[PDB]
From Swiss-Prot, chains A, B:
Protein name: Minichromosome maintenance protein MCM
Source organism: Saccharolobus solfataricus (strain ATCC 35092 / DSM 1617 / JCM 11322 / P2)
Highest rank taxon of the organism: Archaea
One CC-aspect GO term: MCM complex
Transmembrane segments: none
Residue ranges of every copy of the MCM domain listed in the record: 276-480
Alphabetized UniProt keyword annotations: ATP-binding, DNA replication, DNA-binding, Helicase, Hydrolase, Nucleotide-binding
Reaction catalysis annotation: ATP + H2O = ADP + phosphate + H(+)
Outcome after substituting K351E: Loss of helicase and reduction of ATPase activity
Annotated EC: 3.6.4.12
Name of encoding gene: MCM
Effect on the protein upon substituting T359E: Reduction of helicase and gain of ATPase activity
Record's function text: Presumptive replicative helicase. Has ATPase and DNA helicase activities. The latter preferentially melts 5'-tailed oligonucleotides and is stimulated by the SSB protein (single-stranded DNA binding protein). The active ATPase sites in the MCM ring are formed through the interaction surfaces of two neighboring subunits such that a critical structure of a conserved arginine finger motif is provided in trans relative to the ATP-binding site of the Walker A box of the adjacent subunit.
Length: 589, 589, 197
DNA sequence: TTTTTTTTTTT
């Protein structure tokens, strides 16, 4: 049999990328610079360089991966001698394997081969340690000898002790020596099939995967991931007598992909358009006709403001939106669109709408009978967007439970001997119906909404949707029929690039307030307070929370255009959208 | 004694079918084409061809079955050698065994004989792996030897390891080698006897069946199946002392039967009649006379519309029907008929059956306390019809969650640290009693069924059934007694032929909306809104959901006649049926 | 059962053709040999005390002269009046109620149609002032019926009326136990104080 | 799961 480590080393250096930049040479440099200890190789670049190298990697994966990794380690050693005695063993990862098998279609013939599975992470256990080379001492007054039990072989998954001391050839008892035992990081996670591939009428299935060494903590629950590795049978309790020769199947993870420079170039190109703000707004729920002002508000909540963390206090940066409208006003349709484009979103309509289900629940751990906290909807949405549907149908005593979360962005529980605090930094978007199902113009605004003023002050923007028959029905009917006919609007930013644009903006753009914006915001707030004092019958309280809503909204407009500071135009836009919200609740200006 | 292998081979190649077409060769070629590895044969054909061969199969299936499989395998590879290196063992399965035993009547004399059982599947375990040929390594410092312990014999259902190393003739410790261990797919299911055959005052019996190799995932739970195989005594733990010399019995499945091109030809022929639409209406619930409008609506519900899946949104294609009938109006007759005629239907009540009433629920594990999901009635009915009798007394928890499932066709969970989304694309047909015993015509519909007005807008059509004590009482009394004696109508379509007709239409007909139908629907919707606007106390809300109902209903009419497009005639019928619905609730259209 | 005591139980074993010869709730006469029961011989340590179980050899549930006697009774033209007069002889009056209770003892004929099923059982509801001998008659009905179950609204649960899940702690297995309504299949279910349930 | 008494959270 011929060798390929020369070709593998040759491929790492002689491969030419998109612009013949030799990224793998650069990738090796990054590995040495940061002591990354792991390298990722695209399969599409292997068969192109040498198709023969591709098959042997796929087929004889067990007996060829250590050979390639050993050759790469020597290549790194000459590139940087100091890499020695820092990372003894190196790993290489292969992605983009053509062998992809659906979870439900896994059979006996698939065990022992390199395969790829796409699914959803649902739970991850904490990082632990696994023994792959143990050291034992023979406790027998003659011996007092120390040795490594698994000779020339990695220690198996089942912990096995020697029965005869190799140093003396006698039985007895042996004591493990933790100080001379080699360990490897170990983690267990469960993957779940996507709902798209689940057959109708069946519950989704799950598979257990094992992450080891640097692969630990590479993903978090609720992430769409693509995993590659080798399947094997699970010997959880081999000592359990009682027949049962039936075994489960678990996966030995070799590489994992979650969810690129070219994306950055595309995103930056979009921001160069002077009307990028208009394009983003037009891309929010293209299938819904009208509701332009509501679409503008939903865009702001997706981007959000800039949270302020000070040495003595913390200031909320998220934006909260409340929508009240008549039935059949596309409230749920627009909300469902948010979960598709938001990098992280949580939906809750009717189940889990109690106080325990929204923030946190104290559940008795049946394993030990004690108590511990279970994360609620708002806690699970931390760092993302929490979507609440049918808020008006929630009980008042249950609804008040989220007042602390909406403003202080924390959840504190003091129940059954547990006192703890959890972070809930999430944006809340809520929808509901008026008090009498449909809006009534005869009644005032206050009783139509039917919400306490305490919770209304926590919402940055509130919109009232009225379904009044008139001359617009013909336009609405034509638009709906055109949608059903397959016609689609053009010049619209699609979904996946919009999601990338929002994700890039949130973690890379931090606008700052200028002196010009300060004067405009201050003047409007003073004017707004005077108008509120004029009419004591208004259902909306103008508190200092409204002033910070203007600051948050203005920052979001700047962040929407990837601008580094808030200018006069951004402040003017924030004031304008505030005027519409005040007018929508009967507060003229 | 006599080698039937030659007889078996010639029987397959010289089987006189319905026209001496040798259908066994046709399926053998099909088996080679797709690598099916499983050939099923009929016991009647074997008996007709050679009754002597049939007796040997039904009497000595333990001995001669592997012999026949070897002969078939040689014939297959001789016919096509490419089958080799892909399948090393073919399977032959017998069906239609005359030895049928009732489940409750099984006794000790039937152990070890080929019998068939009819019942209902209740539980199906996930697919696992079973060891039938293991490889062991002797951990004794002088051996380092590998061997297959079950020498010249398959591994029994009880996992046993060697006591003395065969290669070195010494005892010690042995380690399993998964990489050199043969595995076979293994699944366990439970079959329950039908309620018809259960004796009075007794609980139904159950039987455990084992599915292996390709038989895994051959039947969804809740299906009536016929199972053929061998019975044997279960051995859960042979090492468990404590007397208990009694054992249960389980079944090794060899062939499973659940519950054509000619049908498609007759289905298309049945659609050639221009009066097919009226014929289908008549065929619906032939037992009940009259109620033509209600019969027409139920026919549309079974066919349904065409769902639209877009880039950013999904549009419901199902049709929901609500029936409010007075007591004694026999509202449960066609409901039972609907369940039988529907290709896939679920029958339930308002409260449901399990803890998950209609949508879903989260249940702690009884043994471990872990949280998992239980499918509700709507989820289990995905892709079919959900018949929900007594809708007016659903659980309070489901009164809110049903809003999302009835419109967005999804169930979202964000409780106890679990985030999930389950599809619920199921048409809903529900019946509810009036809240005042007898329906009141002057009162609106919302205060007559005890449901929120928002739910009413989610129903495409609502029908009221009143037991009017008119002249029909004499006819009705005669009609009721005629049903007691027994009577039937003529010139209809049987449920068996109708069921496949609906199934064919739902899988191959996707009507498209034309311009003529588009204009007709637009004018009516505008007219609908104006009439509701004029009346300040309209009993029914006219929302854009009504416009979707017109599109869905019209598409069902085109699908009813297997039309490729929607024409004016389909639109006109859609308008007319909606007009009657508005009259029924008391709206001057 | 003696005064102030709880009913006792005995374990019996049916083998070969004697299996499934009776249903729960039936009154039976059983003949066989008694023997001590051994279940955990390996469980060493005290427990030198054993329980007794019966090895069944024949079982009887609950015939020519009686059939002749029954036929002679039906020959009387006023047999219906005699039967009604024999329902709760210790209660004065309530002739209409007694007549209806006799009908429920016999019942109708069930009919299986093309699609639906027609029950043959008759349901009776009695509303009366306290002290109107409502409970006395129901006790009589539960005693004269060939198969009847007497329940009370306060002393009944949903699990106890239909079916109760019993976890076999020996093997950790779930199996059903027949409830009051199931045990009354083919008979009469008597429920007292239904309004208090 | 099931009946029971108990303190507790949460249906
Ligand atoms: Mg909605
Ligand atoms: Mg009484
Ligand atoms: Zn030693
Ligand atoms: Zn050996």
């Amino acid at each position: 049999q011929i060798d390929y480590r020369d070709v593998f080393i040759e491929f790492l250096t002689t491969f030419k990328g998109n612009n013949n930049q030799n990224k793998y040479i650069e990738r090796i440099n990054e590995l040495v610079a940061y002591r990354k200890k792991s390298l990722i190789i695209e399969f599409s670049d292997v068969l192109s360089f040498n198709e023969n190298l591709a098959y042997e990697i796929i087929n004889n994966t067990k007996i060829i991966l250590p050979i390639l990794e050993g050759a790469l380690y020597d290549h790194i050693l000459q590139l940087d001698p100091t890499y020695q005695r820092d990372i003894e063993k190196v790993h290489v990862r292969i992605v983009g394997i053509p062998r992809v098998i659906e979870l439900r279609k896994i059979r006996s013939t698939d065990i022992g081969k390199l395969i790829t599975i796409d699914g959803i992470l649902v739970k991850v256990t904490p990082v632990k340690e696994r023994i792959y080379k143990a050291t034992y001492k023979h406790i027998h007054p003659d011996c007092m000898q120390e040795f490594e039990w698994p000779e020339d072989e990695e220690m198996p998954e089942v912990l096995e002790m020697p029965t005869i001391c190799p140093k003396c050839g006698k039985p007895g008892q042996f004591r493990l020596i933790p100080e001379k035992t080699k360990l490897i990081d170990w983690q267990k996670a469960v993957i779940q099939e996507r709902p798209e591939e689940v057959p109708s009428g069946q519950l989704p299935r799950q598979l257990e995967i094992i992450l080891e060494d640097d692969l630990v903590d590479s993903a978090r629950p609720g992430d769409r991931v693509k995993v590659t590795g080798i399947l094997d049978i699970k010997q959880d309790s081999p000592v359990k007598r009682g027949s049962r020769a039936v075994f489960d199947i678990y996966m030995k993870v070799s590489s994992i992909e979650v969810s690129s420079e070219e994306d950055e170039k595309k995103i930056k190109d979009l921001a160069k358009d002077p009307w990028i703000r208009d394009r983003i707004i037009s891309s929010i729920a293209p299938s819904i006709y009208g509701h332009w002002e509501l679409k503008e508000a939903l865009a702001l909540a997706l981007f959000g403001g800039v949270p302020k963390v000070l040495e003595d206090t913390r200031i909320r940066g998220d934006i909260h939106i409340l929508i009240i409208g008549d039935p059949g006003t596309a409230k749920s349709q627009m909300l469902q669109f948010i979960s598709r484009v938001a990098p992280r979103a949580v939906y809750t309509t009717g189940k889990g709408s109690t106080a325990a289900g929204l923030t946190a629940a104290v559940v008795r751990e049946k394993g030990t009978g004690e108590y511990y906290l279970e994360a609620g909807a708002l806690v699970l949405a931390d760092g993302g967007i929490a979507v609440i549907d049918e808020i008006d149908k929630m009980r008042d005593e249950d609804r008040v439970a989220i007042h602390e979360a909406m403003e202080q962005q924390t959840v504190s529980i003091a129940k059954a001997g547990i006192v703890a605090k959890l972070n809930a930094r999430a944006a809340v978007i809520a929808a509901g119906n008026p008090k009498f199902g449909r809006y009534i113009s005869e009644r005032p605004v206050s009783d139509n909404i039917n919400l306490p003023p305490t919770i209304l002050s926590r919402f940055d923007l509130i919109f009232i949707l009225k379904d009044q028959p008139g001359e617009q029905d013909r336009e609405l009917a034509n638009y709906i029929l055109d949608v059903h006919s397959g016609k689609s609007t053009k010049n619209i930013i699609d979904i996946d690039t919009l999601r990338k644009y929002i994700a890039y903006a949130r973690k890379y753009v931090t606008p700052k307030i200028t002196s010009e914006a300060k004067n405009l915001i201050t003047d409007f707030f003073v004017e707004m307070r005077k108008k509120s004092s004029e009419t004591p019958d208004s259902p909306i309280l103008i508190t200092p929370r409204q002033l910070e809503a203007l600051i948050r909204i203005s920052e979001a407009y700047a962040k929407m255009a990837l601008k580094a500071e808030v200018t006069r135009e951004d402040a003017e836009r924030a004031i304008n959208i505030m005027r519409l919200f005040l007018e929508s609740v009967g507060v003229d200006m």
